[PDB]
Design an enzyme around this catalytic site. Sequence first.
Site, short mmCIF file in Angstrom:
data_model
loop_
_atom_site.label_atom_id
_atom_site.label_comp_id
_atom_site.label_asym_id
_atom_site.label_seq_id
_atom_site.Cartn_x
_atom_site.Cartn_y
_atom_site.Cartn_z
N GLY A 120 -69.00 10.88 17.05
CA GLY A 120 -69.72 10.97 15.80
C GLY A 120 -68.99 11.64 14.66
O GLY A 120 -67.78 11.88 14.72
N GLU A 121 -69.74 11.95 13.61
CA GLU A 121 -69.20 12.59 12.43
C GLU A 121 -70.21 13.51 11.78
O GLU A 121 -71.39 13.53 12.14
CB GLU A 121 -68.75 11.51 11.40
N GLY A 122 -69.72 14.28 10.81
CA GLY A 122 -70.55 15.20 10.06
C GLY A 122 -70.02 15.13 8.64
O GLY A 122 -69.13 14.34 8.36
N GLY B 47 -66.19 16.36 8.83
CA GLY B 47 -65.24 15.84 9.79
C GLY B 47 -65.86 15.04 10.91
O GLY B 47 -66.96 14.51 10.76
N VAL C 226 -66.59 14.52 15.37
CA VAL C 226 -66.88 15.23 16.61
C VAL C 226 -66.43 14.42 17.80
O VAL C 226 -66.74 13.24 17.92
CB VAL C 226 -68.39 15.48 16.77
N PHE D 154 -71.35 21.55 23.77
CA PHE D 154 -71.81 20.18 23.61
C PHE D 154 -73.30 20.15 23.95
O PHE D 154 -73.71 20.55 25.04
CB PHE D 154 -71.02 19.25 24.54
N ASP E 85 -78.85 26.53 5.05
CA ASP E 85 -78.92 25.07 5.14
C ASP E 85 -79.86 24.65 6.27
O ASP E 85 -79.54 23.79 7.08
CB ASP E 85 -77.51 24.47 5.35
N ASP F 256 -74.65 24.20 12.29
CA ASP F 256 -74.17 23.97 10.93
C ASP F 256 -74.26 25.17 9.99
O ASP F 256 -75.00 25.14 9.01
CB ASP F 256 -74.93 22.76 10.28
N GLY G 99 -72.06 26.04 7.99
CA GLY G 99 -71.08 25.80 6.94
C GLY G 99 -71.36 26.38 5.56
O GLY G 99 -70.44 26.51 4.75
C1 LIG Z 1 -71.87 13.67 16.95
C2 LIG Z 1 -72.80 13.90 18.06
N1 LIG Z 1 -72.93 15.16 18.54
C3 LIG Z 1 -73.77 15.43 19.57
N2 LIG Z 1 -73.88 16.68 20.02
C4 LIG Z 1 -73.19 17.93 19.71
N3 LIG Z 1 -72.88 18.91 20.59
N4 LIG Z 1 -72.16 19.90 19.88
C5 LIG Z 1 -72.08 19.47 18.61
C6 LIG Z 1 -72.70 18.26 18.42
C7 LIG Z 1 -72.69 17.85 17.00
N5 LIG Z 1 -72.00 19.06 16.38
C8 LIG Z 1 -71.91 19.26 15.04
O1 LIG Z 1 -71.32 20.23 14.58
N6 LIG Z 1 -72.45 18.36 14.23
C9 LIG Z 1 -72.40 18.55 12.75
C10 LIG Z 1 -73.49 17.68 12.02
N7 LIG Z 1 -74.89 18.14 12.21
C11 LIG Z 1 -75.77 17.17 11.52
C12 LIG Z 1 -75.40 18.32 13.58
C13 LIG Z 1 -71.08 18.38 12.07
C14 LIG Z 1 -70.03 17.63 12.68
C15 LIG Z 1 -68.78 17.47 12.02
C16 LIG Z 1 -68.60 18.07 10.73
C17 LIG Z 1 -69.64 18.83 10.11
C18 LIG Z 1 -70.89 18.99 10.79
C19 LIG Z 1 -71.45 20.06 17.37
C20 LIG Z 1 -71.99 21.49 17.21
C21 LIG Z 1 -69.91 20.11 17.52
C22 LIG Z 1 -74.54 14.42 20.18
S1 LIG Z 1 -75.66 14.44 21.46
C23 LIG Z 1 -76.00 12.78 21.38
C24 LIG Z 1 -75.24 12.17 20.35
C25 LIG Z 1 -74.40 13.09 19.65
N8 LIG Z 1 -73.51 12.89 18.59
#
Ligand SMILES: Cc1nc(Nc2n[nH]c3c2CN(C(=O)N[C@H](CN(C)C)c2ccccc2)C3(C)C)c2sccc2n1
Length: 291
Positions: A30-32, A35, A37, A99, A142, A160, A162
């Site tokens: 995924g993404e945020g 950046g 993930v 995770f 946020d 988050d 940030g």
């Molecule tokens: C991408 C994704 N992450 C999942 N789970 C996670 N476990 N740990 C984390 C995540 C997502 N995470 C995260 O920081 N997301 C934010 C966004 N907000 C909306 C949540 C983000 C990502 C990149 C840049 C800025 C902000 C961390 C804590 C690593 C899960 S579970 C099922 C599908 C899925 N798809």
Amino acid sequence: MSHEQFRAALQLVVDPGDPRSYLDNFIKIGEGSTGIVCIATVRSSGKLVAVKKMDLRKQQRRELLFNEVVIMRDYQHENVVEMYNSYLVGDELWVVMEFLEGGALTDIVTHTRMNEEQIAAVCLAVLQALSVLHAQGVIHRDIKSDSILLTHDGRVKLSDFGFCAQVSKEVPRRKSLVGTPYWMAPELISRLPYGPEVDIWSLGIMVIEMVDGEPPYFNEPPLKAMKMIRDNLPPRLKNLHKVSPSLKGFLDRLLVRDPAQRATAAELLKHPFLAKAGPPASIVPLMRQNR
Ligand SMILES: Cc1nc(Nc2n[nH]c3c2CN(C(=O)N[C@H](CN(C)C)c2ccccc2)C3(C)C)c2sccc2n1
């Protein structure tokens, strides 16, 4: 903070080396906003971790990204997402974190209708996290459903940071216009010196999300919604009668314009509504892979 200052500052706080020396099988999931993930496996234990990769150059307000790692490292609370380490790889900041399989709360609020047992569970978890954070002078800034992540077993964690800030006797209030338009506190939109109370108002908007599926004025342009939150009376629930007197009273303590009259997190933990909070298991059925 510039691209060069950001890298120089990070070099003093991040862990040394490259995480690829101990983490295997990186897979992007995924993404945020800042950046992507990836999931990866700890070679020695087979345990899964999430790795946030952020470009140092293509960013805005890097100082907030720097504070997020500095302030939240070594932080540990059952209701707060865990950060294990951080590294500098190429022109990127890699943050190895916990995770969480349950995904964000946004997927749940936009695809189902939570009951008061589930809502009180999320509120209690978030409030436990905030009472501890605020007591230490940390303001999230946020709060919204996107910032709430769930574990496979239904545990709620705040994520988050940030846009977070740290206030101190030296500097007790902040004035930065940060966050997400629809969830921003009125005094914050007004650019007035504000404190931890901004998170309580944002949480209130998150409650409206859990109840109606979206925050107030979501159908309006972001700058327009901000003016309305800033100048008009507190936003109201569309499904006002869909909630119990307990939840109404709860929400009435969050959505108060005058932050001085708004309830603190510590106080809200004692609020009657939270007594309806179900267990982690009650949240599981809500998750996508379980719907
Ligand atoms: C991408 C994704 N992450 C999942 N789970 C996670 N476990 N740990 C984390 C995540 C997502 N995470 C995260 O920081 N997301 C934010 C966004 N907000 C909306 C949540 C983000 C990502 C990149 C840049 C800025 C902000 C961390 C804590 C690593 C899960 S579970 C099922 C599908 C899925 N798809």
